[PDB]
Design a protein around this nucleic acid. Structure first.
Ligand SMILES: [Zn+2]
Ligand SMILES: [Zn+2]
Ligand SMILES: [Zn+2]
Length: 85
DNA sequence: GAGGCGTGGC
DNA sequence: GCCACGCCTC
């Protein structure tokens, strides 16, 4: 009942604010700008900008508690964990 | 590993 | 509107 009434889009969202995020696919709007010296990258989604900053910093906050390997995202770790059993 | 994106608690 | 879990497809 939160329908994306742009053009012929068939999409509805269970949350007014997810529709707004989705509308950015039709407008190109990227409100989230990388502030890394001389970089210039921008994103439609804040969490995508977060993943980006992890390239720059090489921060990997997700540490496997069973080996040395670390990850930038939790899903990568979860997938890796399973490989341990 | 990486990008896109649906989602729900806050 | 943040943020982040997590799933999908490559
Ligand atoms: Zn749409
Ligand atoms: Zn950057
Ligand atoms: Zn491990």
């Amino acid at each position: 009942t939160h329908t994306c009434d742009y053009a012929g889009c068939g999409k509805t969202y269970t949350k007014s604010s997810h529709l707004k995020a989705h509308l950015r696919t039709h407008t190109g709007e990227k409100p989230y700008h990388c502030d890394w010296d001389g970089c210039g990258w921008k994103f439609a989604r804040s969490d995508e900008l977060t993943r980006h900053y992890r390239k720059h910093t090489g921060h990997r906050p997700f540490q496997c508690q069973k080996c040395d390997r670390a990850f930038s995202r939790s899903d990568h770790l979860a997938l890796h964990m399973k490989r341990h059993f």
